[PDB]
Design a protein around this nucleic acid. Sequence first.
RNA 1: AAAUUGAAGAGUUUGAUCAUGGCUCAGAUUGAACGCUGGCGGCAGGCCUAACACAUGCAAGUCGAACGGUAACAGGAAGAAGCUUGCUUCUUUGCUGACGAGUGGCGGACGGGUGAGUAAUGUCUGGGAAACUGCCUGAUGGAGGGGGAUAACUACUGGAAACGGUAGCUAAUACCGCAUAACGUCGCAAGACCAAAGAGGGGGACCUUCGGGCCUCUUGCCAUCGGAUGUGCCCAGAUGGGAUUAGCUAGUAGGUGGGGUAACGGCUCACCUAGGCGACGAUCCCUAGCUGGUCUGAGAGGAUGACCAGCCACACUGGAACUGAGACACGGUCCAGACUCCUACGGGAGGCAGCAGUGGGGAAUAUUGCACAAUGGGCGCAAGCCUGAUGCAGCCAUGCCGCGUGUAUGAAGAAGGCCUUCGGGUUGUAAAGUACUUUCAGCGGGGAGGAAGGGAGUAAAGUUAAUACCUUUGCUCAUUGACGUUACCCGCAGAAGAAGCACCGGCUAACUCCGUGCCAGCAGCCGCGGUAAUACGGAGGGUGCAAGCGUUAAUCGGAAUUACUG
Lengths: 86, 501, 205
Amino acid sequence: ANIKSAKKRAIQSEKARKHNASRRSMMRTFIKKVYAAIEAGDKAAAQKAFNEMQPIVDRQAAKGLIHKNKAARHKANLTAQINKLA
Amino acid sequence: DTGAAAEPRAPVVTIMGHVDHGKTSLLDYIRSTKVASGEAGGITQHIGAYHVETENGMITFLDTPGHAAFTSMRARGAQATDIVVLVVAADDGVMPQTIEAIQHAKAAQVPVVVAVNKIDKPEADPDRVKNELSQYGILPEEWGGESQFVHVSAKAGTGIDELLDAILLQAEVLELKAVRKGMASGAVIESFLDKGRGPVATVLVREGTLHKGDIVLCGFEYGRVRAMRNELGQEVLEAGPSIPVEILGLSGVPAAGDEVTVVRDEKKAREVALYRQGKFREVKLARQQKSKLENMFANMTEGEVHEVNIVLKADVQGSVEAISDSLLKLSTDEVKVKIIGSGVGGITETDATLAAASNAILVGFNVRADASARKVIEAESLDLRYYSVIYNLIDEVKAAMSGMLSPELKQQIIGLAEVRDVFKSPKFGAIAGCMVTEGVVKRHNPIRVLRDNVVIYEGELESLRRFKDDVNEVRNGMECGIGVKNYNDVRTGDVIEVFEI
Amino acid sequence: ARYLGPKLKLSRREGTDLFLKSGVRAIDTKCKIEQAPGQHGARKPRLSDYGVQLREKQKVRRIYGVLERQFRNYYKEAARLKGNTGENLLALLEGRLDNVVYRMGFGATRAEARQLVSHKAIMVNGRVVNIASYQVSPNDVVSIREKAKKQSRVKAALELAEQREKPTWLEVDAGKMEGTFKRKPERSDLSADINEHLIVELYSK
RNA sequence: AAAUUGAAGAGUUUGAUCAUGGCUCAGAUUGAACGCUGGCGGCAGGCCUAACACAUGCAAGUCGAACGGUAACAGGAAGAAGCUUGCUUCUUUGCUGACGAGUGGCGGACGGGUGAGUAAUGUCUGGGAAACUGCCUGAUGGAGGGGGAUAACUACUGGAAACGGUAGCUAAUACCGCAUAACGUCGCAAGACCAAAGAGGGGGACCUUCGGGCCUCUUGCCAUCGGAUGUGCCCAGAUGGGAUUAGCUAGUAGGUGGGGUAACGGCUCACCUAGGCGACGAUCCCUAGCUGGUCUGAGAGGAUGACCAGCCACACUGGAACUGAGACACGGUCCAGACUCCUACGGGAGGCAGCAGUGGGGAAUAUUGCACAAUGGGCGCAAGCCUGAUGCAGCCAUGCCGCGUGUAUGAAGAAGGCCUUCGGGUUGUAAAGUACUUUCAGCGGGGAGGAAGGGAGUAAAGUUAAUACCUUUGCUCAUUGACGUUACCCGCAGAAGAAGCACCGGCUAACUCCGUGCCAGCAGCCGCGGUAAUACGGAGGGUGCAAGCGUUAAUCGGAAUUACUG
């Protein structure tokens, strides 16, 4: 970049990018564990997995990695499905 | 120009000679640059001015190459400079280009000092130079003619101390007149065209003064100065009568050289600039009417009507006027060559269009092809050739001209045959029986029919036939037969001369 | 921006006195008043309908010292204004300062009055107005400023003025060299061999 | 009170006529150009062409009151001395006024440029419902206790440069756990789950580890529900032409369910139904940013979309997402393309449709200027710093408006020119002469306003333990204008420095002589030119405009000549 701060911003945005990427990848992992339990038909594994997932979709919302509404749908959606089976 | 203030200035010096006296070397060594032989051609084909700071005081140097082609540059460089230097070599002695520089020194009434270039070579002696140039009134030594000789190595870098001293003294002995503040005026060294910067000019200012807001008028061109550049220095705030500064912001590329005068307001200088254009345009149409009416006939009296056209755009303004004069020297009565639309720089759409209408070669001393220029040149059939030096150009234009010629002078004879006992044919109207006395007769080779040493008729054979064979070749002392179209009368005793081309 | 040439030519072309000289002289002893200027002045113009309209507009313009652009703009304003356009044109002309200065007798001619104005010799409401076309309003007081009061042109100008018909809508004190634009002149105040409707016709076609 | 209360026709077909019908003119208008000419000023306008390419400067920073900090300069200091004993120079130490480089915060999504693309994820009018929304704002509560890092820096090392490699080492309002957790999110509910950060100003007992504790106020941080502003989304109508384009469509149209977004939605995927669009113009092709408005017209219309303002779209070309409240980013990143610059040859760098400026194209369009003083934007508690936004200045008669280039007097009415039947007529009161004025330009002298604020003190209130500090409001003192030689006013000199352009046969205001002789030439239309040419060219005279005047280009008018009105 040409301007002093523009240079600095590219550096900061890359750091943030690697920070966000790391936390975001983690989060989707814990979401995916729940969908995987559901697809195997286990209430407990899927409830257990939902309980681990809950606090982290909530936290990443508070931290701006995602919006509150996204966290809610995930909880709403998974909760809907797990109940529909056991 | 009021107050009559008189201040000393740095003397402007020009150097002349036969090519190769290491005229450039003298400058580069003083400048501690050595740009010599770093450029295409190995010699200096351009003019430039460079000011250096050396004790005592200040001095600037200007140089022009000496060649048959640059008639104008050496003429203008002499009258502008207060002191002229003439380089001479003991090995070279005096040459017709050097004596040409002698006239420029005396006619411009400029005092002259000279230097012997080679003290290094053992076959080089000063006494030869002094005596042989003694015959000419210029360059006396200790005879009471006030002129002083200097002996320098020019390679060795040997003083020089004497030459420098003479130059300072020669400028010192004569009163140096200038003014620090007043109405600026001067002459233009060299002008060229740039793509980003725009049209520019290198200007020696006689009275030294300048400002970004001041309006400057060069020739029929006018405008406000946007920026100032001095040599390597990219920007200068102020410029004195001594040191030269490249001028920028003028409307268009001015003449190769002329008197430049600044004005208070631009509006007052607009009508004046347009006035000079009207006169230059009136004489342009005047010289156009004369040359066409001069023949006093609707066409040329003879067959020289065949001509070649050329299109030239050179980056520098100084060349187009100078080399064209040398380009008109190679002109001859047989083939006439003329320049059309000499440009200030580069290339353009209307220039490629100019070469499209009339077939011509598009050449430039130094040029690059524009993005819009490539599209036109690549599409229609044309020729784009750029040449670093003027010598490679002056040779090939001649080459173009030499080729244009179509002369058949024969032309060695292939065979000579005499015809006897004519026969009649329906197709060609006649068949002349022949006997070849010498050589071999061929089909498509041209023939010359002559009677009593004068040529009755001329042509090219259509049918060579012996008996019913109709062979394409007949040797000597073998009965042969011949007929041709458009030949009415066959008489015995005449001889037909066939010749290959 | 001003007509600077011979003046009686204008009167001679329009067929009438245009008051372009002081009036000290019978105009017929200064020029051949009843003959147009030029080689062919004696010739009569068998004059077209357009011609009579043109000459009438020229006449008024030449009386007031107004060139075409400004005068056309005067028509435009007269038209825009309420009431009869032809009469509005003459109100606007007659309200000009160079004009009013002339009518109070401070200048022998409108040309002289205009020079008085331009040369900062005239005040309006004790305030210096130096542009000729300044529109003067009811109750305004225009005066010769103190320094210009001893100019002999002005005394002579007031003498001649005293010998012209005296305009109703102006109250002039010759001693003080001040005067008051009481009201806009009516149509009936102004000469009756001006044909405004012709000028109105010229500018509507 | 007033505020669309407005409308013209002429020449030209014919021997002549009436009708038909086209061509042409008078008018307004212009971002104009060219030709001749050119004094001043105020206000405006100024690449319409190549969304062609761009050298150089400048156009986005700021905060030490978040943080480790010193390298510059500035003081200060135990202690070195300049020592001529209070003046001091340098060795030192961030002690502090400040501040390069660094982390961090907020801004680089605004301001400014352009109109390429787009006949619709556009615009205009009018409505909807499923949403987010930095800074500013109201409400109610938090602001507890910890942890591992890292740039800078240090050491070693690679590069021509750009910029790197190792290992050390350290701070925070950088970063992450843990606690706390509802009028929040999920859930019928029971329950389950989510955050944070300090930094400054001043200070009374009181005292220590002299750091501060503690007292107090300012400010920032977290949560939730609002306000305001901004933005996303959906529907209807309108918004160019072409059928010498009539059929178009597989995410296509809908349904179910999963996923997805801030949010509704074929947004996406699977499955199912077989629909959906179209002569009320789909599809395809050409062209084009839309509007307020602008020009013209009595109007209805016609033409149009510079300058100002609103919306959209773009940022070298094609594609992409990252950061962020906001971007798929005008001076950010990545890939590919076109192109250019640097290089020590191994490798690097850049994108003016920001402001100046350059080349190129063109009939044609400006200075590489001054200033943040004013308004407004970014950061900061502030002081202030930045701001080619903006305010101004330069250039061009490009346009609009104003003014000047003198005023008055001046006759047998001169000389000269021009016409003349040689009587005289005209140029012409024109000139000369005579008085007289002095705008503008020139030169000196003086001198508003655009300035509100901000700075020291002071006093009062609200604060509080407090007269501190903070903040508000009065007081005084000294100050802030790029323009600028400002506007404007006074003085001096003299008519002194300031008039050209087109036209004069009819249309059409303005007539004669000489030259030419179907030539040279004119010509908007008719039509002029072969011996009297008011039509060519010169002259005298005249007409119309006037710092302009003509010619060319261009829209509408007249044209009821696309006729809805008609």
